[PDB]
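Dear support,

We are seeing what looks like truncated structure output for some complexes. This example has four components. We would appreciate it if you could run it in full and send us the complete token output so we can diff it against ours.
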Amino acid sequence: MEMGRRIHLELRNRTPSDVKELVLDNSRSNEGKLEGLTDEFEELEFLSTINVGLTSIANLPKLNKLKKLELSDNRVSGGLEVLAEKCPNLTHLNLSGNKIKDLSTIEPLKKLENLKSLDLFNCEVTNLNDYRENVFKLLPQLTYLDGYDRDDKEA
Amino acid sequence: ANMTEGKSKKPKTLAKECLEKYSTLRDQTDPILIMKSEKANENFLWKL
Amino acid sequence: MTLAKIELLKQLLRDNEAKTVLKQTTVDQYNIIRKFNTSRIEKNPSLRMKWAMCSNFPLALTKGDMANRIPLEYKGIQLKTNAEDIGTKGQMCSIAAVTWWNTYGPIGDTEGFERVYESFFLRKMRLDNATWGRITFGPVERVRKRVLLNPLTKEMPPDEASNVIMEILFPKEAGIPRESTWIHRELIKEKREKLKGTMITPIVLAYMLERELVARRRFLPVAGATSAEFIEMLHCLQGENWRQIYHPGSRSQSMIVACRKIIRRSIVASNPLELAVEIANKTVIDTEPLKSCLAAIDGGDVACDIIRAALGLKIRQRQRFGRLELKRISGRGFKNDEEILIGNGTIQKIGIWDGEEEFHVRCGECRGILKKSKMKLEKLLINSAKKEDMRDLIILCMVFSQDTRMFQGVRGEINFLNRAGQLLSPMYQLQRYFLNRSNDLFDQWGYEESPKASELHGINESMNASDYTLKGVVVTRNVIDDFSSTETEKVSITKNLSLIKRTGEVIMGANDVSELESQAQLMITYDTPKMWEMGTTKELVQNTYQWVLKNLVTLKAQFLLGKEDMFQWDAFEAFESIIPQKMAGQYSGFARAVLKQMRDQEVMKTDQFIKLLPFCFSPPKLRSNGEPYQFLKLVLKGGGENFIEVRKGSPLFSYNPQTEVLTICGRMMSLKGKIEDEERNRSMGNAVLAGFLVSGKYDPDLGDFKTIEELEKLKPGEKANILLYQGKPVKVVKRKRYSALSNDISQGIKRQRMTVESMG
Amino acid sequence: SGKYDPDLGDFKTIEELEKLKPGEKANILLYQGKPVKVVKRKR
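Here is the complete output from our reference environment:
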């Protein structure tokens, strides 16, 4: 199975601007990328990339309608500033299970202002003193986190 | 966690109530072994 | 070879004797024909083998092309000869060629041994990983017991074992699969897949499977554990004057609980037998009906024995009274009604046994011999096994003996019932009274001097090995071995579940079962609404989801039609009991709207369909305007963890599509995927020639016969010409459904009794 | 709005009360043996 097969199954061989969500899960990728998603995409709301072996974020269509994106179980470790230049309209961010070394990796999210929830589970950065407080004062725009900002609501 | 008024109760009753609240874990009979010690036997520990 | 087969057949028929015998003896009679061998068995195998090993070519090689791999003489050593043979019609050879083959020659495949000889390698694994301990040189007390020599993958009776073996490794000759392949479908498919890819002779595999399935049991002297794993090593573990510590490298409690629940459910109603058997054969334990472990173990708890009697199975004919297992030794007791005053002052009319009698008595781990006369216990010999078991044995034998002292020792009252609320006979009422208050007849029974002797030593009322014992009771420091001649004699079953001998005598009563509740260590999934309206909400949800899952094909087919008849199913009525009354209607309306949307504007999604279907049993209550209410969290009775998540999953229900698995009430089940493709993968076991019924005779209109692979090509409802068993041409029709004879019989009985009651 | 209804579930902690939504009814406990049933209000 490949990203192309998932794209064909979800789109069912139709125009790219017909679905506002994608499910790219359990898909092998060339050197850890997210190919199979052409830049021609114009409308997209939800994303899902799990067990894709994504190692970096360097290929992504420019978008202005996406609000949620899901990355998990990946060895990606690099600056995410490119998201601002690609789609500065993210509201739900999920990095659960990813591999991030230190706090500097999550710095480039400051320039994004629409993010309200960020998820980081069993991450090497999560095991630090005052990581919760340090992240909060580092990303003032954030309104939610792993789930315990002040209360518990569901996405 | 099992919220309580604040009364003092025997540990056995507290454990019983806590397992009742999380009944799914208590009624687990098929173990999905994840890791094993070099010498210990998983079956014996699970049965215990 | 088939041409060689036909040529050999023609040559054999050329003689008139072959023609007359072949055309005379039917296929069934073939067995007799085979047994007419010379039987000139060697008188002394040792001498024969010794002589043969010194002969030039004792080995009898089968004619073939293998010999060309090896010369008739290698390195100046004679190996094989080209002289003809009369005994086997092959060639002759010597062990020299065998050793050379072990040295050089063709190299075979090593895969087959990984799985084919699974039992032997499992034995080796259990030996290697076992942990040894100290050795206790002191004397060891051993009891003679009927033990299973070797562990079994799935114990089954010999006939079922043979049928399963044939269904596994003999795809042909599989006419009309019985009511045994569906029970063992998982074993069938597992062994079929494992043994595929081999080239060993089929008879070897058949014998190995027979060893792996058919049970082997024997009388052995054992002390301690008794599972087959320990019996394998009994030769090293045990010892007349030495013992070793050994730890080799469940369903029972669940079946006990299920049988007890079935007994309690059926007794309260009239005609308990039919209802009990319906529930028993409609029950399942995680992969199989109850006739998969009941038929495995020998005997068991009284409830299991009664259920087996209700079903078709063999039960040990020991007399169960409360917990006592009694085996008569001699004497005949005349059961005559008599009026006896009880110690409480009341007078009861009950049956008493005139005449002397003796019984071997067992209870848990306690064995003994009891000798009783009418209205009196005479003698009791026991071994020290356990305080609880010894007390139970003493009290139960006391009550059974109907000793006048036991009656005069009553002090309270006897008006008890069972969990079903029924008044029992005075004997069982007294049993319960004395067991509840053990220190009632013990105090006034009277004491007897200690058994002054080399080994015979007494026991006091407290069960401690203390002298000044009870009148009659004696504890011998020896081993009492009892319960011989387990004839499994013919036993009848009355409607009220109480068994009786070939004569009118009663062996097991409906009330022998003890009213003790436990927790099923496994998923006890029934198939009848009547049963599961007892337990907790989690059990109800699990059973409803299992009912939905089992008959997924029918529900999925009815979904396409789009009619409300699909939702008005009795299976969900019990579910209605665990949904809040004030809000169940809103759930039903919301789920109905969601499922209509699913049918209209999207495609199949099994997980959400299963999740949302059951809540629609109750009538809907739409919004004032008319639109359905919307929810995302269905609350259930008990609150807290008893709640369903509409979106992805919850404690009671969570389906993961990455691996396509289903977790219900903390239990993982394999939904390979969706689609009739996954339906057929579920049907990947079953049995060869299971989708075809028999109808008509040869009917040569179809010409020659067709194989199973070509049989599948035919569309449902066609007619095909096939061979049944060893020949027997017949005409068959491909089935359009899956059948269950037990369900049909149960429904017929239900209709019959409904008619009887309506006329009455 | 009512009284103790075991069907609705056990008593709800402040954590669940704070995250509750208007128009939803819950159960609370004043002291040992005096439970009560309450409902959220917009005002």
